[PDB]
Design an enzyme around this catalytic site. Structure first.
Site, PDB file in Angstrom:
ATOM      1  N   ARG B  59     -19.805 -14.057 -35.000  1.00 51.05           N
ATOM      2  CA  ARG B  59     -21.008 -14.852 -35.183  1.00 51.05           C
ATOM      3  C   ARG B  59     -21.841 -14.591 -33.926  1.00 51.05           C
ATOM      4  NH1 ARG B  59     -21.752 -20.591 -34.172  1.00 51.05           N
ATOM      5  NH2 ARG B  59     -23.495 -21.372 -35.447  1.00 51.05           N
ATOM      6  N   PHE B  64     -28.826 -17.530 -28.151  1.00 55.15           N
ATOM      7  CA  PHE B  64     -27.996 -18.711 -28.187  1.00 55.15           C
ATOM      8  C   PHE B  64     -26.602 -18.349 -27.672  1.00 55.15           C
ATOM      9  CE2 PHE B  64     -25.463 -21.531 -31.407  1.00 55.15           C
ATOM     10  CZ  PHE B  64     -25.168 -22.458 -30.432  1.00 55.15           C
ATOM     11  N   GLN B  67     -19.903 -15.365 -30.496  1.00 49.70           N
ATOM     12  CA  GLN B  67     -18.664 -16.080 -30.769  1.00 49.70           C
ATOM     13  C   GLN B  67     -17.600 -15.110 -31.250  1.00 49.70           C
ATOM     14  OE1 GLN B  67     -19.370 -19.347 -33.616  1.00 49.70           O
ATOM     15  NE2 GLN B  67     -17.228 -19.910 -33.826  1.00 49.70           N
ATOM     16  N   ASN B 106     -14.862 -25.094 -31.576  1.00 49.24           N
ATOM     17  CA  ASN B 106     -13.860 -25.986 -32.142  1.00 49.24           C
ATOM     18  C   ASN B 106     -14.382 -26.488 -33.486  1.00 49.24           C
ATOM     19  OD1 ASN B 106     -15.570 -28.414 -31.669  1.00 49.24           O
ATOM     20  ND2 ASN B 106     -14.969 -28.355 -29.543  1.00 49.24           N
ATOM     21  N   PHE B 117     -16.985 -18.860 -27.116  1.00 44.22           N
ATOM     22  CA  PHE B 117     -18.318 -18.284 -27.099  1.00 44.22           C
ATOM     23  C   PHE B 117     -18.807 -18.047 -25.664  1.00 44.22           C
ATOM     24  CE2 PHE B 117     -20.770 -22.310 -26.238  1.00 44.22           C
ATOM     25  CZ  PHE B 117     -19.859 -23.294 -26.581  1.00 44.22           C
ATOM     26  N   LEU B 126     -24.455 -29.051 -26.109  1.00 47.22           N
ATOM     27  CA  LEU B 126     -23.039 -28.838 -26.314  1.00 47.22           C
ATOM     28  C   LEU B 126     -22.157 -29.476 -25.243  1.00 47.22           C
ATOM     29  CD1 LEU B 126     -23.108 -25.162 -27.579  1.00 47.22           C
ATOM     30  CD2 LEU B 126     -23.043 -27.253 -28.881  1.00 47.22           C
ATOM     31  N   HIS B 130     -17.621 -29.293 -25.983  1.00 42.50           N
ATOM     32  CA  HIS B 130     -16.862 -28.041 -25.984  1.00 42.50           C
ATOM     33  C   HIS B 130     -16.328 -27.790 -24.578  1.00 42.50           C
ATOM     34  CE1 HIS B 130     -18.143 -26.762 -29.952  1.00 42.50           C
ATOM     35  NE2 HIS B 130     -19.129 -27.574 -29.646  1.00 42.50           N
TER      36      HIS B 130
END
Lengths: 11, 182
Positions: B59, B64, B67, B106, B117, B126, B130
């Site tokens: 991903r 951004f 991942q 997660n 990531f 975030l 995380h």
């Protein structure tokens, strides 16, 4: 939107 | 002067299709999040018989993050830790301070497995959700080469971005990564 998930990715 | 210390390093040699684009080296904050670091190191060396070698960045979202780490299902639903399928959020002492910090993906509280990531922005939304545990020390050019890859409708690159080799590099003396408040 902008999340980092593992399974149900959301907006 | 003031910040957390890097205690361990992990490298990822990356190939996009069949072109070797180079190495990512990640410094890990073993004193701050020991269990989360031990997991990532073990999965990078492959010393429990499974891990990150041969897995892909599944991903990739421009400006951004990228991942990866799903070495069991390779799509985003799997992965696994050396402590079992999931392990608790160790603590949230580190924030996603800026570009190139490394954190655990997660599916809600205490569901850390193997997916992670690398940030390409400062994702303050975030923080506290995380567990942050590392920072890219070398190879951000490689991370941006993965970022610029065309993706499908689910943000998966249309050409596999593969970790063809991974492992650890020992740190003889820990060194500080300066962060704002510490």
């Amino acid at each position: 939107x902008l999340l980092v998930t593992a399974g149900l990715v959301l907006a | 002067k003031r910040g957390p210390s890097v205690t361990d390093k992990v490298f990822f040699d990356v190939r996009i299709g069949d072109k070797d684009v180079g190495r990512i080296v990640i410094g890990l904050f073993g004193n701050v999040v020991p269990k989360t670091v031990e997991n990532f190191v073990a999965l990078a060396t492959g010393e429990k018989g499974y891990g990150y070698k041969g897995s892909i960045f599944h991903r990739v979202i421009k400006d951004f993050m990228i991942q990866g780490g799903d070495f069991t299902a390779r799509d985003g639903t799997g992965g696994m830790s050396i402590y079992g399928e999931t392990f608790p959020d160790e603590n949230f002492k580190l924030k996603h301070y800026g570009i190139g910090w490394v954190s655990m993906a997660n599916a809600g509280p205490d569901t850390n497995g193997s997916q992670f990531f690398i940030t390409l922005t400062k994702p303050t939304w975030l923080d506290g959700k995380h567990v942050v545990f590392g920072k890219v020390l070398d190879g951000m050019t490689v991370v941006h080469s993965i970022e610029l890859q065309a993706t499908d409708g689910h943000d998966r690159p249309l050409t596999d971005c593969t970790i063809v080799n991974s492992g650890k590099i020992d740190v003889k003396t820990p060194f500080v990564v300066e962060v704002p408040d510490w």
